[PDB]
Amino acid sequence: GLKAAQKTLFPLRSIDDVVRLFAAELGREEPDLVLLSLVLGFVEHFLATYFPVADLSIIAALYARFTAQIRGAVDLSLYPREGGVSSRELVKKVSDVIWNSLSRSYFKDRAHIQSLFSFITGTKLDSSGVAFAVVGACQALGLRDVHLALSEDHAWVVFGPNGEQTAEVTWHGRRGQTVNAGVAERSWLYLKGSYMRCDRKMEVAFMVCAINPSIDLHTDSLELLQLQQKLLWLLYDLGHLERYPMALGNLADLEELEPTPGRPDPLTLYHKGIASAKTYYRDEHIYPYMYLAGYHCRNRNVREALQAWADTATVIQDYNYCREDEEIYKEFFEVANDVIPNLLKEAASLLEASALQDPECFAHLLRFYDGICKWEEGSPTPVLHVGWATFLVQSLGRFEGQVRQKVRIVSGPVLTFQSEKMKGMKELLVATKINSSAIKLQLTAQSQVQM
Amino acid sequence: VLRDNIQGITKPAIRRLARRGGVKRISGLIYEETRGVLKVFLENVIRDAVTYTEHAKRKTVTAMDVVYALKRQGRTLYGFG
Amino acid sequence: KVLRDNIQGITKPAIRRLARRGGVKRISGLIYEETRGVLKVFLENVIRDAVTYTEHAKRKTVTAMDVVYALKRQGRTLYGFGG
Amino acid sequence: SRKESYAIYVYKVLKQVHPDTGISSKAMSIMNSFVNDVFERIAGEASRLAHYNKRSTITSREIQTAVRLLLPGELAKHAVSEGTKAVTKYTSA
Amino acid sequence: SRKESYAIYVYKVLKQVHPDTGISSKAMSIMNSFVNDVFERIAGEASRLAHYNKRSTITSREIQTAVRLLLPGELAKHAVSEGTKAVTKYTSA
Amino acid sequence: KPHRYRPGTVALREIRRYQKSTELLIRKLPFQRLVREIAQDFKTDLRFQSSAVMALQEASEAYLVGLFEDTNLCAIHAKRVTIMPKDIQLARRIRGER
Amino acid sequence: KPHRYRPGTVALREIRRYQKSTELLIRKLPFQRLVREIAQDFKTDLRFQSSAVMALQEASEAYLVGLFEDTNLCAIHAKRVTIMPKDIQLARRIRGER
Amino acid sequence: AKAKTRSSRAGLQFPVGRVHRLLRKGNYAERVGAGAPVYLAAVLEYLTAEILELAGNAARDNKKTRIIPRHLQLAVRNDEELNKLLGGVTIAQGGVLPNIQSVLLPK
Amino acid sequence: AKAKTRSSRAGLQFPVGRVHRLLRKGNYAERVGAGAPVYLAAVLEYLTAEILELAGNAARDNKKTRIIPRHLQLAVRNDEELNKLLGGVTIAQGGVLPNIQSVLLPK
DNA sequence: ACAGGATGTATATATGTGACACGTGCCTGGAGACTAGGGAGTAATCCCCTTGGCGGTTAAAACGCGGGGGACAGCGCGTACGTGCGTTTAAGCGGTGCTAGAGCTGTCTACGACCAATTGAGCGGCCTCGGCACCGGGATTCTCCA
DNA sequence: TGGAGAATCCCGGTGCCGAGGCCGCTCAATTGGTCGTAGACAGCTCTAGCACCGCTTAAACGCACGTACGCGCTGTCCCCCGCGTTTTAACCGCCAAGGGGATTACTCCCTAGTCTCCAGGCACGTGTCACATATATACATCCTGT
């Protein structure tokens, strides 16, 4: 309901006003998602120092219209209630109504459409935005037993007493299907069931993480960055962000983008994120490690960067590649073929009158490629082709022969291979002169691939 | 990504293909059967086209790769190279 | 002498044996002539190509290699006679 | 004159897979023709692959692509693996 | 850079057969592909003939036998006649 | 009283119309999307020349037209005029594809 | 009082016997004379290796058995069990030989 | 030493020199005879002339002055020998030969 | 220096040297790489081993220790991939797969 | 069968325009004239293997007789497809922009061809001993007439 | 629903012609060099593939209705199958005759390779008309009452 306290808060036109509103909404067992969601969306969409004029009348009108639509479309008396458990048909109808609110012309992945402020005032909404709109409407409906589920990329809504029943209410960038089939395929879109289970605190975390300060391809808004910094730091002071590794990574990125005294350095927050991934999700998240690796890539320290990328490969070792999770493949392809070649080239140029001459850096690179190869094996779709082979040969070339020779491939640091393709390189490479033809022939072979 | 675009091969399009082939009445399941047949043929051709493209170390599937794949399958095509 | 027909030597029982190896129960009475026509056509093509291969090599004897090459031209590779 | 055949090598492979199973002479002729035909197919496809790309040499990569083109499915996968293993062992020695 | 084609020769033949008929660009490309395909068939068959028979060169009679093997029916007879006429005219002077 | 032709005559007129012409009978954008979706399982992030998709479309239309001619022969053989999936399967089996 | 069998069963016994074996189903001498006559039509005074005629016989029998399998499929298609010449023509037209 | 083309000497229109070069570089045999390119050029010219004569007839039957893929396909399919030669070949943008089964007809 | 066959160096039973000679003298390309005969011999040995293992199993399913063309055909036609590979071929002296259609068989 | 109502489509005339046929610079590949070396033509020889005939066995083909199983035609019906129509949806065209990657040019370096040496391997004969079909008796299993 | 019939397999002894092993012995695969050049790699640069938006209108869609046709059922008959008898030509074995497939040796001539030179075929640019499209006229054809 429209609380009198929430109206008495009287949010003014100030960032600290938004922070205080978030703090007040985070004192109850269930914060008003649509209220804070619409406020953040309005500020972003209007902006995307002339602070947006916060108008309680327009927000109230939009909230009333949304509530009327949700109540008229979805009524509790139309379906049975199991004494505090929501049924599948209820959530299915909620999702159907939320999708029917949209139009035929899709968003085309356009930016600034990740919040409910645009969705209520328009007919465009992205996948995560659609799932969060479903959750917010369900919460306004009084069905609190349902919760949003976040994979690394794909977002959906879980429900039931303990979240035992799942339904991917939103497409992949189709309303009700189980997640067990997707987990059975060992695909990164589902994290093998290790996706986080989000509560309303985590919903506030998602709303603050989803803010996109990019005005366009070139220009950004500093006020949005400062807002996100304040909100994220407050929510971390609450401790809620602790379970959300992407939140810690984004907060560290903001901190390094603009330092703030009295708060831990970005590297500490990155390590805290990777540790939260290490404990709570059975070391299955990938983006924490790529956050840390990108942070090291920003600076001229390639040892830890390659170590983090090798760690990312060890994370991705277990999965199987399919057409569904193309995004992780595109990020690994970018990393392996555009940033590592350039990073090693710059390091070699610095060496030519160190980053190279270190056996450990070479071992990290070999473990990264070994993780990629292990990822490929057993996958329905092939991962490696000539585009990978040329840059792998180049990257092995950047290292000197005697440097590579101080490496031990068992079963200078010791390093073992879990992948079948690298069982030939275990002697083909780590020789005085690299045989490019054999390496490319071994890599580009379509073995260890199912179809 | 792209999903369930096999339905883009519409029932009217299949009917036009059949009429060119010269059939008068078309049962109601010929559409699903023809979609399966077309998907199989396309997969068979595209695999060889992609193999020819990879061997040339290119990222773009040329018309010569397609005509080579068809020639390999025994379906020579005239007018593209 | 010049052979007259010799096609009837592909007998009705032999055609029935070939059909049974194909897994057929009943045989209509006109199959015994349709199949003789089919076999004459097939052999005419294969023998034409084998004789061409032989005559090109300035030979007078049709080698088994000529026959397997003629079959491979038809897209009917034969195993066990060289190649 | 000397007649080239794979009878010795087919027999060695048979003894490798079936130690106590012999092979008939006609079956040996069938296997010899099979090896010749598959060799001709793979080498011819490699020749076409060389010609298409304006390359004047047949190398292991073109043989591998020809094997991907000719052999179907799991045959292609395992034959490719076997070829890469043999070439890797040859080069490293 | 430069691209080789049979377009000028196809057009010469067309003008000498149908003096008042032109040809489209797509039809020209189809005829060019037809000429290339037939040339490849005859040359590949001639190569196979010169390898089966223990020879190393491709002569006029290898091409004649390849034409006799590939071309069906009366196409073969007329093509052989035209080719022999051309060769006799060539070697005559 | 509206005039409606007896069933099976518009079909004949359409047979004549589509045998007289040479237009690509499948729409171009849906077929391009289908080709890309199919190729997206042999190698990620491919690119296609427009000539490549046109070649695929010409080949596929010719293949399906030939297949439907064989299917129509099968349907007539069984004393029918309508083609049914058993006819397509018989034609594919006899040609050796299946 | 003779005891006989249904016409169906002896056909199946023949199918079993003729599918478990590898023997040539056409007598050698008539086939050899047929081959020699067909060759006589092309070039005269021609001689054949014994292996040549054996290879021709293997190919011809395999071809006829494959054709009869396709004809059996055609006859089953028309809701029959007897194979009739129209089935042979259908198989040969679909396979592209006619 | 005035130069007269081999094609002109042979009385053809197709290129003897180009055909000889293609046979040489094509990897068909170690050596290529002198009369082989002339024979192959004559055969190719004959086949092209045949299919273009039929195509020109087909184009005139439609009251047109240009040969398009449709006319080439009509020429190919209506002639039994050229149809047999170009059996598995697709003539792109060529349509199909107009023909309806007699069963599927109200007579 | 001590002699050593390339077949033994790559761990192959098939002759790498003979395959290299065939690739050179067969006119497949102007040059052949050093690893091409090794790759081709490995593939040939793999295919021979696969088909011979299947033929030996088929012979063992017949209480015979001598492989005959019938067993070769049984092995080839009972494999869903070798059947596709050897689709246009006919093994001499080999029968046909025992197969009587269900609708044909009376119930 | 035959004549109107309505029909999609044939016949005829015209503007547009974008592709087709032609002219030009030129440069790249083809033509003309030695050189030489090996492939192929030619002739004599061996002897393997093809053709041709005779002669007896018995396997298989040819022929005729029920007879009953399956092909073919006619009927009925009911259902699933074609035909039209108004509504919706996305193809198609047309700009506008970005940039990835195809095609190409210049190094330059590693790899395959040639060649001399020769030695261990793979092929042509020649035993020799076991695997497999033949024969023969016993057990089994599915199948038309009461 | 229970008895006679015809294959069909399981098990034991055999002696055989074929695969496996042994012996020479050449010959071609291996070793080691050079040496030229094919392609590997880097940088560049233009082009054409991808993406996006907006309008138009062609085409897909959902729906109702009639009805042509697919399919099941029944009846008749005809013609294919199984069986017994005769017969006839395949087949196995043997013996001759010779011709034509392989092989070798000599030589000669024909094609690869090189060099010089030039002209004809390709890229670029330009007139221009063949054919597509729109409308006005027209005309065989399909459906239905006669």
Which residue stretches of B1-81 are H helix? 11-21, 30-55, 63-73
Rg of chain A taking only CA atoms, in angstroms: 25
Strands H90-91 and B77-78: parallel
Cα(F5)–Cα(F1) distance, integer angstroms: 13
Q: Which of H82-89's residues contact partners 24+ apart within 8 Å by CB, and which partners?
A: H82/E75, H82/H50, H82/H51, H82/H54, H84/E72, H84/E73, H85/E38, H85/E70, H85/E71, H85/E72, H85/E75, H86/E34, H87/G96, H88/B74, H88/B75, H88/B76, H89/B76, H89/B77, H89/B78, H89/E34, H89/E37
Q: Which nt has its C1' nearest the CA of D25?
A: K19
| CA of residue A375 to C1' of nucleotide K78, angstroms | 70
Query: Which residues of chain H lie closer than 8 angstroms to E7, CB-CB?
Result: none
In DSSP notation, A183-205 reads HHTT-TTTGGGT-EE--HHHHHH
Cα(A37)–Cα(A80) distance, integer angstroms: 30
Q: Please, how many CA atoms are within 13 Å of residue D59, restricted to the half-sphere of its CB? A: 10
Hey, are the CB atoms on C81 and D37 less than 8 Å from each other?
no
If you ran DSSP here, which 8-state letter would residue A408 be given? E
Which residue stretches of A122-221 are H helix? 127-140, 180-184, 200-209
Hey, are the CB atoms on G22 and I94 less than 8 Å from each other?
yes
Cα(A188)–Cα(A330) distance, integer angstroms: 13
Whichever domain contains C52, its CATH number is 1.10.20.10
Asked if D5 CB < 7 A from strand J, the reply is yes
Tokens of A109: 């992945």
Domain layout of chain H by residue ranges: 6-85
- Nearest Cα neighbor of E61 from H39, H25, B62, B2 is H39
Nucleotides of K under 7 A from a protein CB: 3-9, 18-20, 27-32, 38-42, 48-53, 59-61, 66-71, 79-84, 89-91, 99-104, 110-112, 118-123, 130-131, 142-145
Give the structural domain span for F77: 2-98
Cα(A179)–Cα(A159) distance, integer angstroms: 12
**Dihedral of the CA atoms A419, A422, A427, A430 (nearest 10)?**
-120
User: Quick one: residue G96, left, alpha or beta (phi over 0 = left, psi -120 to 50 = alpha)?
Assistant: left
Hey, are the CB atoms on I95 and C25 less than 8 Å from each other?
no
In DSSP notation, A78-112 reads GS---SS---HHHHHHHHHHHHHTS-SS--TT-SS
Cα(H72)–Cα(D27) distance, integer angstroms: 49
Whether residue E69 lies within 8 A of chain H, CB to CB, comes out as no
Q: Which amino acid is at H68?
A: I
Beta carbons of G89 and C35 less than 8 angstroms apart: no
| CA of residue G91 to C1' of nucleotide K76, angstroms | 31
Which residue stretches of chain H are H helix? 6-10, 16-25, 35-61, 69-78, 80-85
Cα(A334)–Cα(A318) distance, integer angstroms: 20
Asked if B45 CB < 7 A from strand J, the reply is no
Q: How far is CA B80 from CA F49, H95, I68, in A?
A: 12, 16, 48
Beta carbons of D82 and I42 less than 8 angstroms apart: yes
Tokens of I40: 């081709």
Cα(E28)–Cα(H68) distance, integer angstroms: 8
Residues 76-95, chain F, CB closer than 7 Å to nucleic strand J? 82
Considering its fold, how many domains does chain G have in total?
A: 1
Hey, are the CB atoms on A323 and F41 less than 8 Å from each other?
yes
Whichever domain contains G38, its CATH number is 1.10.20.10
Q: Which nt has its C1' nearest the CA of F20?
A: J9
Q: How was this structure determined?
A: cryo-EM
Beta carbons of H38 and E29 less than 8 angstroms apart: no
Q: Give strand pairing partners of F82.
A: B25
| CA of residue G78 to C1' of nucleotide J75, angstroms | 21
Cα(A52)–Cα(D49) distance, integer angstroms: 64
Cα(C55)–Cα(C66) distance, integer angstroms: 10
Phi, psi dihedrals of residue I91, rounded to the nearest 5°: -75, 120
Tokens of A396: 């092995």
Q: Which nt has its C1' nearest the CA of E61?
A: J40
Beta carbons of A191 and A154 less than 8 angstroms apart: no
- Nearest Cα neighbor of A43 from A277, A263, A212, A160 is A212
Q: Is the dihedral of CA C24, C30, C34, C40 positive or negative?
A: positive
CATH number of the structural domain E24-92: 1.10.20.10
Cα(E53)–Cα(C53) distance, integer angstroms: 9
Beta carbons of A248 and A269 less than 8 angstroms apart: yes
Q: How far is CA A173 from CA A95, A332, B1, G20, in A?
A: 17, 18, 6, 57
**Fold category of I6-85 in CATH:** Histone, subunit A (1.10.20)
Q: Is the dihedral of CA A67, A70, A73, A75 positive or negative?
A: negative
- Nearest Cα neighbor of G59 from I78, C66, H85 is C66
Give the structural domain span for B42: 1-81
Q: Which residue is nearest to nucleotide J82 (CA to C1')?
A: F7
Q: Which nt has its C1' nearest the CA of D22?
A: K19
Cα(A292)–Cα(A256) distance, integer angstroms: 12
Strands E22-23 and A196-197: unpaired
SS3 for E53?
A: coil
Cα(G60)–Cα(G39) distance, integer angstroms: 15
- Nearest Cα neighbor of I39 from D68, A312, A451, A102 is D68
CATH architecture of D7-92: Orthogonal Bundle (1.10)
SS3 for A146?
A: coil
